[PDB]
Amino acid sequence: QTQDPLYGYFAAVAGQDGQIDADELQRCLTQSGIAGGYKPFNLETCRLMVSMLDRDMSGTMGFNEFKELWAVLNGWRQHFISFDTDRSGTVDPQELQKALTTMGFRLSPQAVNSIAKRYSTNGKITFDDYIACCVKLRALTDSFRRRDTAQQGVVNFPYDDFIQCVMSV
Amino acid sequence: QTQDPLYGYFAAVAGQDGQIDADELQRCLTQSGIAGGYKPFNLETCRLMVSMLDRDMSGTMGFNEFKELWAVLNGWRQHFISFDTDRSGTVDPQELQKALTTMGFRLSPQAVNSIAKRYSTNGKITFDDYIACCVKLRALTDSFRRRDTAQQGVVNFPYDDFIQCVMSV
């Protein structure tokens, strides 16, 4: 069995059960350099990542999930860079719209406006907020799709299931 | 017409249109001392507050909304203090459950677990995360109730409306 190059970072912070929480993910994401020159992800953003991958509200994730996370974040960063050619670490609401669309998110104009207002300061969205945005979008889209068993694009949400689901991200 | 004691803090940071964004709210919340000894609210948490009150994704709020916000946060802080008598600035998942229940949130046990995992580090929830939790809970509960026109406790969410709504908080 081949050694995976991500394993050292993970093994150095995992608990006794072979899992990591948000705090430990924060550390191994920073050591592993996934942000590649941009500001490293804060604890809050790492909590969102944990929920996106564990999809079970344990607050922890295993190595296989860490590897999947790492590949997803690597691709999102490359995508961001194609809009941030000068590497400012920011992007504007027009660039954000086009960035979200091209990565497979299907969003009405007012959905995009909701998102721009949510994450912009001074007409700009940081790399870190862009990633947080993508993590939460993918987690919520996975949650919605999971529940849309009839594939109608509409989900019937009981209140407590809605709260459970949306408060995890 | 009587002067309101909150107006000075608001007027010092409002834009030309008489509204404030999250950044300006952050400043006037800190100057106004609403956190009362606990750590002042960060920008992200102030973004959630703006969405809770404006309920329209403009990213801004007026003075009347600021006043309502201030009263809501004052009551939540008092409520927190009744569980944080020694004023550690933290609370544990058992205290959090009872705190949420007594302030009128109706949450199943697994909804509460979702929330504890989402905000706890080392078995503790900070005052600032408690407030963020309450802001998001009230905003999402308002969003759900608004849409539950038949009062069945179930809402039919189209995907883009779901995303719009949940990405604002």
Residue numbers in the entry:
A (entry chain A), B (entry chain A): 30 to 198
Can I see the authors' text?
Sorcin (Soluble resistance-related calcium binding protein) is a calcium binding oncoprotein expressed at high levels in several human tumours, such as leukaemia, gastric, breast and ovarian cancers. Each monomer of Sorcin homodimer is formed by two domains, i.e. a flexible, glycine-rich N-terminal domain and a C-terminal calcium-binding domain (SCBD), endowed with five EF-hands3031. The SCBD can be divided in two regions: EF1–3 (residues 33–134), which binds calcium with high affinity, and EF4–5 (residues 135–198), which mediates dimerization. Upon calcium binding Sorcin undergoes a large conformational change that allows it to bind and regulate a series of target proteins in a calcium-dependent fashion.
To investigate the structural basis of Sorcin activation and of selective calcium-dependent signal transduction, we here solved the structure of the apo Sorcin (apoSor) and, for the first time, the structure of Sorcin in the calcium-bound form (CaSor). Briefly, the monomer is formed by two domains: a Gly-rich N-terminal domain (residues 1–32), partially visible in both apo and calcium-bound structures (residues 30–32 and 26–32, respectively), and a calcium binding domain (SCBD), containing eight α-helices (A-H) organised in five calcium binding motifs (EF1-EF5). Indeed, the rmsd values measured by superimposing CaSor to the apoSor clearly indicate that upon calcium binding Sorcin undergoes a large conformational change, mainly involving EF1, EF2 and EF3. The comparison between apoSor and the calcium-bound Sorcin structures sheds light on the mechanism of cation-mediated structural changes of Sorcin, which is fundamental for the comprehension of its function. The residues with a difference in SASA (Solvent Accessible Surface Areas) higher than 30% between the apo and the calcium bound form of Sorcin are Tyr67, Ser80, Met81, Met86, Ile110, Arg116, Gly118, Ser143 and Ser197. Tyr67 is placed on the loop between helices B and C, and in apoSor it is hydrogen bonded to Asp113 of the EF3 loop and is partially covered by it. Upon calcium binding this interaction is broken since Asp113 participates in ion coordination; the rearrangement of the EF3 loop causes also the exposure of Arg116. The superimposition between the CaSor and apoSor shed light on the mechanism of Sorcin activation induced by the calcium binding to EF3: the binding of the cation promotes the movement of three calcium ligands (Asp113, Asp115 and Ser117) towards the E-helix where Glu124, the bidentate ligand, is located and consequently, a large movement of the D helix with respect to the E helix (about 15°). This movement is transmitted to the EF1-EF2 subdomain via the Tyr 67 placed in a strategic position, in the middle of the loop connecting EF1 to EF2, and anchoring the EF1-EF2 subdomain to the EF3 loop.
